[PDB]
Amino acid sequence: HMKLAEALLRALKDRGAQAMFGIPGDFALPFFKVAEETQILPLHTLSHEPAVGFAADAAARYSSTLGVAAVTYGAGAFNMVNAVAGAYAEKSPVVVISGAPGTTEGNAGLLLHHQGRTLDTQFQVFKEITVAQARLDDPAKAPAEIARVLGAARAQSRPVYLEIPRNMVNAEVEPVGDDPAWPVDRDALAACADEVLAAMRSATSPVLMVCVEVRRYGLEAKVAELAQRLGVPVVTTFMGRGLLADAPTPPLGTYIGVAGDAEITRLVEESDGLFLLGAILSDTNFAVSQRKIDLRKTIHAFDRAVTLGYHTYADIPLAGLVDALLERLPPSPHAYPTGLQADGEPIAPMDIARAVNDRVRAGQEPLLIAADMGDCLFTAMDMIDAGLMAPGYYAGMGFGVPAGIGAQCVSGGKRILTVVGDGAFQMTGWELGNCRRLGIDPIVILFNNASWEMLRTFQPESAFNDLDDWRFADMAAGMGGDGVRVRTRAELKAALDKAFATRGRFQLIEAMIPRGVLSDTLARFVQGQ
Amino acid sequence: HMKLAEALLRALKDRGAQAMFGIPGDFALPFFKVAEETQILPLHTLSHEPAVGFAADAAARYSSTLGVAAVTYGAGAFNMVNAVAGAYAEKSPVVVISGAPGTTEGNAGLLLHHQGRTLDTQFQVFKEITVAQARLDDPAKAPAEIARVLGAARAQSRPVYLEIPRNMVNAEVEPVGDDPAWPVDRDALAACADEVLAAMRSATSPVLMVCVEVRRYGLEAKVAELAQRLGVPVVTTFMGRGLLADAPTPPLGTYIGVAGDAEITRLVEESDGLFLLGAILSDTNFAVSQRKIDLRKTIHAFDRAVTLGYHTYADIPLAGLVDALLERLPPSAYPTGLQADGEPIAPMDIARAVNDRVRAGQEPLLIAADMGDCLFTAMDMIDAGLMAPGYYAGMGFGVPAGIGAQCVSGGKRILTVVGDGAFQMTGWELGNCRRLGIDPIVILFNNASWEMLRTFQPESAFNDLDDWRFADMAAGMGGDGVRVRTRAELKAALDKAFATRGRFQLIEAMIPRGVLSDTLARFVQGQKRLH
Amino acid sequence: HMKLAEALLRALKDRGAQAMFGIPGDFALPFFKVAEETQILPLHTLSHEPAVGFAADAAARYSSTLGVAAVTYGAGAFNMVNAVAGAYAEKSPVVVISGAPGTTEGNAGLLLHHQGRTLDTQFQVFKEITVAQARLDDPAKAPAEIARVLGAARAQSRPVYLEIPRNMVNAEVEPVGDDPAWPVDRDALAACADEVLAAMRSATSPVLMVCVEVRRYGLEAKVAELAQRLGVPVVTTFMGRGLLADAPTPPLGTYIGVAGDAEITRLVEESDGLFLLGAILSDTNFAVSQRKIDLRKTIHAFDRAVTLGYHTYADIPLAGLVDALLERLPPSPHAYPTGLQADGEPIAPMDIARAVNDRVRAGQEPLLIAADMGDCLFTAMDMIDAGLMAPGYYAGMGFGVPAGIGAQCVSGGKRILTVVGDGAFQMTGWELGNCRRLGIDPIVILFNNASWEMLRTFQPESAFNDLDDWRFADMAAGMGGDGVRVRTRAELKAALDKAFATRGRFQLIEAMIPRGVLSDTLARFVQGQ
Ligand SMILES: Cc1ncc(Cc2csc(CCOP(=O)(O)OP(=O)(O)O)c2C)c(N)n1
Ligand SMILES: Cc1ncc(Cc2csc(CCOP(=O)(O)OP(=O)(O)O)c2C)c(N)n1
Ligand SMILES: Cc1ncc(Cc2csc(CCOP(=O)(O)OP(=O)(O)O)c2C)c(N)n1
Ligand SMILES: O=C(O)C(=O)Cc1ccccc1
Ligand SMILES: O=C(O)C(=O)Cc1ccccc1
Ligand SMILES: O=C(O)C(=O)Cc1ccccc1
Ligand SMILES: O=C(O)C(=O)Cc1ccccc1
Ligand SMILES: O=C(O)C(=O)Cc1ccccc1
Ligand SMILES: O=C(O)C(=O)Cc1ccccc1
Ligand SMILES: [Mg+2]
Ligand SMILES: [Mg+2]
Ligand SMILES: [Mg+2]
């Protein structure tokens, strides 16, 4: 036997969790107390719950494991609905742990601070944005519930929800067992793999298109081998940008329809054997298509199913399929913008892409990139990376900075490059004030165009997309980092070199960008939509 | 523009409805008044709501069309839940029409007679046993709703629910248009047909097994042609007994595993190309198997889907698949000898009697059977089709079904087989024959017992029933009854029943307790294994 | 420990159940086996499930206790929805026990005979017509579930639902404990009783109107004492006809608005202190009011609440209130149609009322009366009785005959008088064929007018209300009873005398009644509606 809170933390750690992010409240104090005193999982606090969710999500994307977000009842949990809905959409297994009233509280005739219409209102809301839930209000059942919920998060790669009455944190329970098993029919898998391979082999111009699930289930290496053995080109989706960064043979590029490279777009759209491997069928990934794409003519492996030839194979895990394909195969690109003119001219999005890329070509091992939504994301699309995480489908802003924070918190010393615009920084960039206590020194390039540019690009006439010029670099000092505003390419270049040479605190390079000055990609992308 | 009730009755007739069965109640009197006056559909009344449902259901089964059951709010509707769940389970499109309180009633601080906990309670209940429902409380929208709902009933071949406030019965509305269109992807259909056909051709011993949907969608003639072009034997499921009764080449037989003909069973379970066409995967159809059949290795077309090779093709209508297959293909013993002596009557003697008449020239009658040894015996009868609750297995279906079918059979007589247990539930409906202008022949297997249950658990006393003199009670209901105890009397009684028209003919056959068809005996043991 | 089925039967018996009615099916065989071999509760089978429900309901109304109805999965249970919905409406605590597939059945890839869309479909349907439900699929929990469900049936006086997987019938469990307790605030009760008494004392013409709950909770004797101590007249509702039959001072009559006695109607409608004690606020009870009745000006005690003076007292049990009123009070009629002319003239409804009433006045102790819906009920309204049960609010037909059967099954030798019309007899009158095996000999007076008269009375023009003339008396013999058709008052009188003098089998007096010939009450009642 052991305390329930302790059994839970150990169960998470046993399943790969590397840390726990959170913000306490009276309902969660007992649980945080156990998390801090046991130190089973490193405890990192943030300033506002959205960042807690985003960071757990990034830690999960970074290591392809479970992310852990702990909050208090109501004020905490409801403040994380947006980040969780986003993790659900982009299939990131974030474990939401919320404190709640004790099992005997609420029967005094009084309404309790933080509750919704009913004490169960919060549970009801999270049912909508998670794949499994459990209220750990029965010691006898807790272990099975925990294994069931965490088991679901790992299999479905989506968020789960655990509610812990505060009087149960220290209740004695048996250790948590293994995840329930999800049966897989060997004959179905065999047949599916046989039909998929045959479809790829009969195609004249086959294309392997990789997306999120490839990372979620840790299949990047195996999938590079599959492309290798099949002898076909690999292209990522917009959502899947950054996949196979460590592959001996990198993908040919990223498919962005009318907004991406013309040859990749033609290769993808004219393919008679397009294998959408673990892809989200989103507008962001396919609405930008120049020529209407017939999804029914593709091979689609997603959500533990495989569809092709107008029919679906149920209960087929991506990992199982990849292994099955490999077993049947015997052993055995778009240019990056470069050459930045570090002079006295104004900074444009692509100049930032060039600066980054030039240091790498010059010898700097690339950095994993965390990106927020805005032109910063369409610009990162042309950056050299060691992986990339961004809200490519949910597209909610605020992800960038806390994602870089969460990822670096578990990166074992490797720095994370963060790209975010002024609108997004206003929302959550402030979380950087926590870098000192957390012990990380991310490099953040803030695209300051004093505007919600993407929206102006969408509806140029409106005035509400105008924003003041916040002196983000001047405020960096107050949050404990080094901030520098840059207006010229030479200042940009120099600032970037200083940032990389300076560790110990966050480096905010505030890049002044004129309104109307965008990356090549964004413009066309918007019009495509 | 026209009255809602009238627009509904026309929409029902436009879709093949042939009659409306029902029992009235104050909340429905208006609706019934219109029906009676407009005569858009013959209005047949019965004694108890369960029969209303079964008859409407039998009528839909007989003509492969919609069935219409009209009842009153609460006391009427709720009393039909069992028949509707059964029609749902057995894919019969029964259209339930219920009278309801006026759109303004129930706002005087008072509860209304017949209502459930809430006025919407009945609606919530029916959502569980219907594929679509609609409360016709908006004249502007009634037409389109009638269309959506009746269309779902037709496409999915299951029951639907229509709730009519009594102050809406005579409300002006536009006429009802066509059902919405469920467009089928031609490319998917093509891929599906090609794969199914390839599988059938690569099999060395293919078998086409037909079940309910074949009749529901009126595909019997096309399936018989399909089998011919494919050159494959046709077998029915237990539920499908009676299918292709009027085909040039009838099915080889009916599969019932350990309880059926050993040859048919062998053919079915050894097949490397078992095509389950419109089949319900029920314990009644397959838990009888000699050896567990691996259903994932069959070709299964059911509920607008087609599964084979461990994958499924969604949105593929059974009729669409049959036609697709036919476009890819170029054209190309019953028990007898009743010994009419003084020996007691056993179930099989009854099949022999029925079959000898057919062999001597009698055109076979369609059979309506209830659940009990009557059904298992009917498995051995020559028929012009047969309807029974072979999956839901709910008793009481027998007599009402026979009645419902004969009401729409344009003169053809229906033979009904039923046990004493089931007759006690709905056999009494025969008292409506005169008024309905029908005279069905009813063979009542009377063993003073719930014999099928005794077979499951012989040690129990509660299966011993009293002896009711059903034949003696026939007269009071307007029919001719005769109780038979010997095989000779059985034979005489049957000839007289066929020779006598104008009144329903009831032949009450006394079967000794503990005497049951081998089929029933083996079926029960077969099912027991599943516990 | 003991077998679950056995624990359940004992729990029912401990709570007053006197019998179990049912029809088996393979899913329920194991349970019926236990019921028959243990004989904890006498087992009575019927022919069709509707009668099972109606009979359980009557047994419950008869002894003011729990009624027990046992059926098989699907074909059995769904066939009882109407009788159960009726018991729910008229507040009769019928315990529905249904057999179901074993906990491990249904996982073989096969659909199971009797199931609805899903295995849980039946459970879902019964939730709509019961106050509590439980699937006894966990031996550990079974005892608590049983006590919770049966506890709810007794407190709320409505049907409950128990589903028993067949593989659980013989599972070992601990004996069932007591019902969970439903707290009652002493101060609230005290205040409520004080305000009610004061309202009755300040009224100039107070009227105590009794309805169903008075019988359901066994308050007839105590309520007669209350009227006695308060010094006020007692009138029943239409639904409550038959209440206080054993009261030293019988009620003044039954309130049926424009369809009842004029003086009772005036007394009720002009009352400044109308106490609706345990009444159903139905159209059948109040829509017949001559003068619109302001329910808000009344005192209403129903469903564990009391409303008066535009306000409601929650959680006030009727029994508690009656006891409270009694504690604050120190110690201390409409004529019956009679004189039947037993001559050669045709039989009319009221003649039947007179025949019955004359035997009683002549010395025959009245019989409890079971009535179906139709003119038979409006006629029984003018009969002398030892109590009366009828679907006075739900108004569903088919209740009559099986109700008389169920009641007599638990009447300990007392005969039950049943009144039913031809339409209703066609539905369930056939259940009489079971009287011999069950050992009862009810007297049944069938009003044969070859018609659904009530409906013709409602819409005279229609032809579909015409019915053939079934020779019910001629068919009685086949069901093992004595049947006699009567056309003249002299035949009626004589038939009734023969019936009472003949015990050993059911006596069916088929009274031929001309169409259009009704009781006085029905005509006006219909027009009132
Ligand atoms: C939580 C949330 N609220 C609003 C929006 C809607 C939006 C999509 S893009 C954008 C403008 C972003 O301006 P930014 O300075 O960050 O970068 P840039 O456009 O290149 O100038 C907004 C407000 C989203 N996606 N999420
Ligand atoms: C509405 C309903 N309630 C109970 C049952 C359960 C049952 C299945 S079989 C059977 C006995 C039938 O006796 P019967 O005399 O009719 O025929 P036979 O067995 O050959 O003697 C019962 C009670 C079903 N299926 N449906
Ligand atoms: C289950 C159910 N279905 C229909 C109805 C609707 C109805 C209310 S009254 C009546 C006619 C009854 O004729 P009966 O011969 O029984 O007695 P009488 O009218 O005096 O001639 C019907 C059909 C109800 N209430 N319940
Ligand atoms: O601890 C919290 O989350 C709070 O909001 C503080 C608090 C605690 C109890 C009542 C009101 C506020
Ligand atoms: O999740 C994303 O946003 C991705 O693009 C996938 C990914 C995540 C982390 C490193 C590389 C790719
Ligand atoms: O018409 C019906 O369905 C009835 O049950 C008759 C009725 C109508 C109004 C109140 C009570 C009974
Ligand atoms: O619906 C049934 O019970 C069947 O067995 C199908 C059927 C119905 C009518 C005639 C032939 C087959
Ligand atoms: O026992 C019952 O309730 C039945 O309906 C009999 C039965 C049992 C198993 C399959 C089909 C019918
Ligand atoms: O429940 C009813 O129908 C009543 O009228 C109440 C009643 C029941 C049994 C005996 C006396 C009164
Ligand atoms: Mg901006
Ligand atoms: Mg029998
Ligand atoms: Mg009548």
Side-chain angles (χ1 to χ4, degrees), chain B residues 175-194:
Chain B
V176 182
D178 311 310
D179 316 320
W182 298 50
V184 174
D185 181 315
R186 243 53 175 63
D187 297 301
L189 184 54
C192 184
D194 288 341

PDB file of all heavy atoms in Angstrom, chain B residues 175-194:
ATOM      1  N   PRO B 175     -48.602  19.193 -49.566  1.00  0.00           N
ATOM      2  CA  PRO B 175     -48.486  17.738 -49.685  1.00  0.00           C
ATOM      3  C   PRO B 175     -47.048  17.277 -49.393  1.00  0.00           C
ATOM      4  O   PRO B 175     -46.094  18.052 -49.524  1.00  0.00           O
ATOM      5  CB  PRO B 175     -48.901  17.487 -51.130  1.00  0.00           C
ATOM      6  CG  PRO B 175     -48.335  18.689 -51.827  1.00  0.00           C
ATOM      7  CD  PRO B 175     -48.736  19.818 -50.893  1.00  0.00           C
ATOM      8  N   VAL B 176     -46.891  16.019 -48.989  1.00  0.00           N
ATOM      9  CA  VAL B 176     -45.561  15.500 -48.688  1.00  0.00           C
ATOM     10  C   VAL B 176     -44.832  15.125 -49.977  1.00  0.00           C
ATOM     11  O   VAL B 176     -45.426  14.502 -50.863  1.00  0.00           O
ATOM     12  CB  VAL B 176     -45.642  14.251 -47.791  1.00  0.00           C
ATOM     13  CG1 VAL B 176     -44.235  13.769 -47.444  1.00  0.00           C
ATOM     14  CG2 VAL B 176     -46.422  14.571 -46.533  1.00  0.00           C
ATOM     15  N   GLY B 177     -43.556  15.509 -50.080  1.00  0.00           N
ATOM     16  CA  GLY B 177     -42.762  15.190 -51.258  1.00  0.00           C
ATOM     17  C   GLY B 177     -42.034  13.855 -51.147  1.00  0.00           C
ATOM     18  O   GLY B 177     -42.407  13.010 -50.331  1.00  0.00           O
ATOM     19  N   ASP B 178     -40.991  13.660 -51.955  1.00  0.00           N
ATOM     20  CA  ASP B 178     -40.225  12.406 -51.933  1.00  0.00           C
ATOM     21  C   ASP B 178     -39.295  12.335 -50.725  1.00  0.00           C
ATOM     22  O   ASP B 178     -38.996  13.354 -50.096  1.00  0.00           O
ATOM     23  CB  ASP B 178     -39.355  12.257 -53.190  1.00  0.00           C
ATOM     24  CG  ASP B 178     -40.114  12.518 -54.481  1.00  0.00           C
ATOM     25  OD1 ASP B 178     -41.212  11.946 -54.679  1.00  0.00           O
ATOM     26  OD2 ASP B 178     -39.590  13.296 -55.308  1.00  0.00           O
ATOM     27  N   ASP B 179     -38.822  11.131 -50.416  1.00  0.00           N
ATOM     28  CA  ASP B 179     -37.908  10.959 -49.296  1.00  0.00           C
ATOM     29  C   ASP B 179     -36.612  11.648 -49.670  1.00  0.00           C
ATOM     30  O   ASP B 179     -36.360  11.888 -50.846  1.00  0.00           O
ATOM     31  CB  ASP B 179     -37.618   9.480 -49.055  1.00  0.00           C
ATOM     32  CG  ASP B 179     -38.859   8.629 -49.116  1.00  0.00           C
ATOM     33  OD1 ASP B 179     -39.909   9.072 -48.611  1.00  0.00           O
ATOM     34  OD2 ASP B 179     -38.784   7.509 -49.659  1.00  0.00           O
ATOM     35  N   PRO B 180     -35.789  12.017 -48.674  1.00  0.00           N
ATOM     36  CA  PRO B 180     -34.517  12.671 -49.004  1.00  0.00           C
ATOM     37  C   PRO B 180     -33.680  11.621 -49.716  1.00  0.00           C
ATOM     38  O   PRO B 180     -33.940  10.425 -49.585  1.00  0.00           O
ATOM     39  CB  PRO B 180     -33.945  13.031 -47.640  1.00  0.00           C
ATOM     40  CG  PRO B 180     -35.185  13.287 -46.821  1.00  0.00           C
ATOM     41  CD  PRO B 180     -36.087  12.147 -47.235  1.00  0.00           C
ATOM     42  N   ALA B 181     -32.680  12.054 -50.469  1.00  0.00           N
ATOM     43  CA  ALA B 181     -31.856  11.102 -51.192  1.00  0.00           C
ATOM     44  C   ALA B 181     -30.599  10.691 -50.433  1.00  0.00           C
ATOM     45  O   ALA B 181     -29.868  11.540 -49.919  1.00  0.00           O
ATOM     46  CB  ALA B 181     -31.474  11.681 -52.544  1.00  0.00           C
ATOM     47  N   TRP B 182     -30.374   9.380 -50.356  1.00  0.00           N
ATOM     48  CA  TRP B 182     -29.192   8.813 -49.712  1.00  0.00           C
ATOM     49  C   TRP B 182     -28.298   8.427 -50.892  1.00  0.00           C
ATOM     50  O   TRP B 182     -28.281   7.268 -51.311  1.00  0.00           O
ATOM     51  CB  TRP B 182     -29.535   7.537 -48.921  1.00  0.00           C
ATOM     52  CG  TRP B 182     -30.504   7.690 -47.777  1.00  0.00           C
ATOM     53  CD1 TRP B 182     -31.724   8.306 -47.809  1.00  0.00           C
ATOM     54  CD2 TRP B 182     -30.355   7.167 -46.446  1.00  0.00           C
ATOM     55  NE1 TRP B 182     -32.346   8.200 -46.581  1.00  0.00           N
ATOM     56  CE2 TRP B 182     -31.530   7.506 -45.729  1.00  0.00           C
ATOM     57  CE3 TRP B 182     -29.349   6.444 -45.794  1.00  0.00           C
ATOM     58  CZ2 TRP B 182     -31.723   7.149 -44.383  1.00  0.00           C
ATOM     59  CZ3 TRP B 182     -29.539   6.088 -44.454  1.00  0.00           C
ATOM     60  CH2 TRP B 182     -30.720   6.442 -43.766  1.00  0.00           C
ATOM     61  N   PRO B 183     -27.559   9.392 -51.456  1.00  0.00           N
ATOM     62  CA  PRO B 183     -26.675   9.119 -52.597  1.00  0.00           C
ATOM     63  C   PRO B 183     -25.560   8.115 -52.283  1.00  0.00           C
ATOM     64  O   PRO B 183     -24.829   8.267 -51.304  1.00  0.00           O
ATOM     65  CB  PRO B 183     -26.133  10.502 -52.944  1.00  0.00           C
ATOM     66  CG  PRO B 183     -26.040  11.151 -51.598  1.00  0.00           C
ATOM     67  CD  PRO B 183     -27.355  10.763 -50.956  1.00  0.00           C
ATOM     68  N   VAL B 184     -25.439   7.092 -53.123  1.00  0.00           N
ATOM     69  CA  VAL B 184     -24.429   6.054 -52.949  1.00  0.00           C
ATOM     70  C   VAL B 184     -23.208   6.379 -53.795  1.00  0.00           C
ATOM     71  O   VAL B 184     -23.347   6.800 -54.940  1.00  0.00           O
ATOM     72  CB  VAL B 184     -24.979   4.666 -53.381  1.00  0.00           C
ATOM     73  CG1 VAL B 184     -23.872   3.624 -53.333  1.00  0.00           C
ATOM     74  CG2 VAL B 184     -26.126   4.253 -52.473  1.00  0.00           C
ATOM     75  N   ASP B 185     -22.017   6.201 -53.229  1.00  0.00           N
ATOM     76  CA  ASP B 185     -20.782   6.463 -53.965  1.00  0.00           C
ATOM     77  C   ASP B 185     -20.584   5.326 -54.982  1.00  0.00           C
ATOM     78  O   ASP B 185     -20.286   4.191 -54.618  1.00  0.00           O
ATOM     79  CB  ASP B 185     -19.596   6.535 -52.996  1.00  0.00           C
ATOM     80  CG  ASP B 185     -18.268   6.829 -53.700  1.00  0.00           C
ATOM     81  OD1 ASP B 185     -17.983   6.214 -54.753  1.00  0.00           O
ATOM     82  OD2 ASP B 185     -17.491   7.669 -53.190  1.00  0.00           O
ATOM     83  N   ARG B 186     -20.764   5.633 -56.262  1.00  0.00           N
ATOM     84  CA  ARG B 186     -20.629   4.629 -57.314  1.00  0.00           C
ATOM     85  C   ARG B 186     -19.258   3.945 -57.330  1.00  0.00           C
ATOM     86  O   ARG B 186     -19.155   2.744 -57.611  1.00  0.00           O
ATOM     87  CB  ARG B 186     -20.922   5.272 -58.679  1.00  0.00           C
ATOM     88  CG  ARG B 186     -22.143   4.701 -59.418  1.00  0.00           C
ATOM     89  CD  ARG B 186     -23.414   4.702 -58.563  1.00  0.00           C
ATOM     90  NE  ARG B 186     -24.615   4.278 -59.297  1.00  0.00           N
ATOM     91  CZ  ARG B 186     -24.803   3.069 -59.832  1.00  0.00           C
ATOM     92  NH1 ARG B 186     -23.870   2.129 -59.730  1.00  0.00           N
ATOM     93  NH2 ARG B 186     -25.936   2.796 -60.473  1.00  0.00           N
ATOM     94  N   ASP B 187     -18.206   4.705 -57.029  1.00  0.00           N
ATOM     95  CA  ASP B 187     -16.855   4.154 -57.014  1.00  0.00           C
ATOM     96  C   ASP B 187     -16.682   3.127 -55.902  1.00  0.00           C
ATOM     97  O   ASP B 187     -16.035   2.102 -56.091  1.00  0.00           O
ATOM     98  CB  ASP B 187     -15.812   5.264 -56.825  1.00  0.00           C
ATOM     99  CG  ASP B 187     -15.798   6.258 -57.971  1.00  0.00           C
ATOM    100  OD1 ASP B 187     -15.561   5.833 -59.126  1.00  0.00           O
ATOM    101  OD2 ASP B 187     -16.026   7.462 -57.711  1.00  0.00           O
ATOM    102  N   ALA B 188     -17.242   3.416 -54.737  1.00  0.00           N
ATOM    103  CA  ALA B 188     -17.129   2.498 -53.616  1.00  0.00           C
ATOM    104  C   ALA B 188     -17.900   1.233 -53.979  1.00  0.00           C
ATOM    105  O   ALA B 188     -17.411   0.105 -53.812  1.00  0.00           O
ATOM    106  CB  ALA B 188     -17.706   3.138 -52.353  1.00  0.00           C
ATOM    107  N   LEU B 189     -19.104   1.429 -54.497  1.00  0.00           N
ATOM    108  CA  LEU B 189     -19.942   0.308 -54.894  1.00  0.00           C
ATOM    109  C   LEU B 189     -19.194  -0.595 -55.864  1.00  0.00           C
ATOM    110  O   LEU B 189     -19.200  -1.816 -55.711  1.00  0.00           O
ATOM    111  CB  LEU B 189     -21.228   0.816 -55.546  1.00  0.00           C
ATOM    112  CG  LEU B 189     -22.261  -0.241 -55.924  1.00  0.00           C
ATOM    113  CD1 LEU B 189     -22.597  -1.108 -54.706  1.00  0.00           C
ATOM    114  CD2 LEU B 189     -23.507   0.462 -56.453  1.00  0.00           C
ATOM    115  N   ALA B 190     -18.528   0.008 -56.846  1.00  0.00           N
ATOM    116  CA  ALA B 190     -17.788  -0.757 -57.848  1.00  0.00           C
ATOM    117  C   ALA B 190     -16.669  -1.581 -57.220  1.00  0.00           C
ATOM    118  O   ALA B 190     -16.507  -2.772 -57.524  1.00  0.00           O
ATOM    119  CB  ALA B 190     -17.213   0.177 -58.897  1.00  0.00           C
ATOM    120  N   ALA B 191     -15.897  -0.940 -56.347  1.00  0.00           N
ATOM    121  CA  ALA B 191     -14.799  -1.618 -55.673  1.00  0.00           C
ATOM    122  C   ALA B 191     -15.359  -2.780 -54.847  1.00  0.00           C
ATOM    123  O   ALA B 191     -14.810  -3.881 -54.857  1.00  0.00           O
ATOM    124  CB  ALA B 191     -14.055  -0.640 -54.768  1.00  0.00           C
ATOM    125  N   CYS B 192     -16.458  -2.519 -54.146  1.00  0.00           N
ATOM    126  CA  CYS B 192     -17.092  -3.530 -53.301  1.00  0.00           C
ATOM    127  C   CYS B 192     -17.550  -4.746 -54.093  1.00  0.00           C
ATOM    128  O   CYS B 192     -17.232  -5.881 -53.743  1.00  0.00           O
ATOM    129  CB  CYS B 192     -18.287  -2.937 -52.551  1.00  0.00           C
ATOM    130  SG  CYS B 192     -19.035  -4.111 -51.394  1.00  0.00           S
ATOM    131  N   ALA B 193     -18.306  -4.505 -55.155  1.00  0.00           N
ATOM    132  CA  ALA B 193     -18.799  -5.591 -55.990  1.00  0.00           C
ATOM    133  C   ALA B 193     -17.656  -6.403 -56.592  1.00  0.00           C
ATOM    134  O   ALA B 193     -17.715  -7.624 -56.610  1.00  0.00           O
ATOM    135  CB  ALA B 193     -19.681  -5.042 -57.090  1.00  0.00           C
ATOM    136  N   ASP B 194     -16.618  -5.735 -57.081  1.00  0.00           N
ATOM    137  CA  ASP B 194     -15.499  -6.447 -57.678  1.00  0.00           C
ATOM    138  C   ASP B 194     -14.831  -7.369 -56.673  1.00  0.00           C
ATOM    139  O   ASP B 194     -14.474  -8.513 -57.007  1.00  0.00           O
ATOM    140  CB  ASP B 194     -14.444  -5.476 -58.232  1.00  0.00           C
ATOM    141  CG  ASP B 194     -14.903  -4.759 -59.498  1.00  0.00           C
ATOM    142  OD1 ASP B 194     -15.851  -5.254 -60.147  1.00  0.00           O
ATOM    143  OD2 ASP B 194     -14.302  -3.711 -59.852  1.00  0.00           O
TER     144      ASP B 194
END
